[PDB]
């Protein structure tokens, strides 16, 4: 998770400048091997998010997720479907086996003149006790 | 598309020509210190025409519009025999530049109202148009206040658009 340090304030700024509330196609980086976000690398990443900081207790959203996931794919080579969580009813538990963060619910001049949402929670047993599997048993066999 | 410049002396009717080709009427026009632009659309060619007034304090600044010019109009006054010398001076000063080297010349013999007013031929030989080099010059005797000869100059100009 070395080249994930150089965009650790840079992409998070674009996440935080993204509101939590041309181009066509998909390029693939040549000759770089691709793999999903594996278990021990998610253990390597959940501790990378535990140690580098700036993520815990932040306002999670989907626009921030997609800014983040494609940046992992283009700079680290990982399939950007790993940051998937359980839907609306219930705690937004990760479907990813190894992601130890569950999602609980919680510039300035773009406002007009007179005027006429989630967050992380570290759960180290989400890597072993797949709580999203308890929320979705029939999908995981 | 054609970038057109209307250079020449003051009181030449050059704004009178410019609002007769564009609008079609002789508007009461102040002596124009700055410039005017009206895209005249004629012979299905959108002549983008940069009319620039011809007073003393503007004539140095004429060099700034001499880039990507494809066509000139050097209006003279037919009622100015005293100013044809400096109009000849203005022409030789101006035509001798590397910027604005590939633009044709269409001289208007405006203000044909008097026996004082000359034809194209005397104005040709007072200005000395036969002394010219790398030029598709062609004088066109025009009457600004009646529209006479104006679009026929614009007729010949659209011929010299393409090659």
């Amino acid at each position: 998770s070395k080249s994930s340090v150089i965009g650790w304030p840079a992409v998070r700024e674009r996440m935080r400048r993204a509101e939590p509330a041309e181009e066509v196609g998909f390029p693939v980086t040549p000759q770089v091997p691709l793999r999903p976000m594996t278990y021990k690398a998610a253990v390597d990443l959940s501790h990378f998010l535990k140690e580098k900081g700036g993520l815990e207790g932040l306002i999670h959203s989907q626009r921030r997720q997609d800014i983040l996931d494609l940046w992992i794919y283009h700079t680290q080579g990982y399939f950007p479907d790993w940051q998937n969580y359980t839907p609306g009813p219930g705690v937004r538990y990760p479907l990813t086996f190894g992601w130890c963060y569950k999602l609980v619910p919680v510039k300035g001049e773009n406002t007009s003149l007179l005027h006429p949402v989630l967050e992380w929670r570290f759960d180290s047993r989400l890597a072993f006790h797949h709580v999203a599997r308890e929320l979705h048993p029939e999908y995981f066999k | 598309e054609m970038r057109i410049l209307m250079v020449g002396l003051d009181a030449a009717g050059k704004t009178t020509i410019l609002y007769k080709l564009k609008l079609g009427e002789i508007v009461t026009t102040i002596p124009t210190i700055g410039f005017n632009v009206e895209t005249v659309e004629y012979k299905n060619i959108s002549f983008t025409v940069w009319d620039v007034g011809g007073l003393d304090k503007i004539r140095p600044l004429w060099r700034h519009y001499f880039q990507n010019t494809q066509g000139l109009i050097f209006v003279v006054d037919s009622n100015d025999r005293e100013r044809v010398n400096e109009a000849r001076e203005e022409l030789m000063r101006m035509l001798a530049e590397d910027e604005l080297r590939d633009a044709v010349l269409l001289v208007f013999a405006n203000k044909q109202d008097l026996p004082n007013a000359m034809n194209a031929a005397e104005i040709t030989d007072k200005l000395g148009l036969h002394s010219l080099r790398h030029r598709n010059w062609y004088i066109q005797a025009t009457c600004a206040t009646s529209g006479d000869g104006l679009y026929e100059g614009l007729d010949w100009l659209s011929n010299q658009l393409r090659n």
């Binding site: 510039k107 300035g108 001049e109 773009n110 406002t111 007009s112 003149l113 007179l114 005027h115 | -």
Partner: protein, 142 residues
Amino acid sequence: MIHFILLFSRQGKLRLQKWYITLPDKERKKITREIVQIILSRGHRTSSFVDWKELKLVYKRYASLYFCCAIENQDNELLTLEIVHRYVELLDKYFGNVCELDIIFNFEKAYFILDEFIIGGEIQETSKKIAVKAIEDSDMLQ
């Protein structure tokens, strides 16, 4: 007479110049560099004014962004700071929670807000409602 207006960052990064006096660009780049250096080298209990070279130079910090004026040495000073604050109010008016990053972004209208407020170095609208009304109508004109 306001001779010019400067808005420079906590890092001195100028977010606005508006020269109501005609002095050339080298002199613009000289003088602007000096006063930013002057104000950033100046403490918080230093009376919000600088007597800088026959200009009672007005500064008034509101955020990380710093503020600057050059008033004529015959005019008022606290009102000159209130001129800044009325303009601060109009920036607070037209934006609301007026804030640093769209000063960097939407500066083009902050000039236009200044154009609705100060032309020539002086005030044209002493109301705070009628001016932002007019710029909204020209924005409603687009």
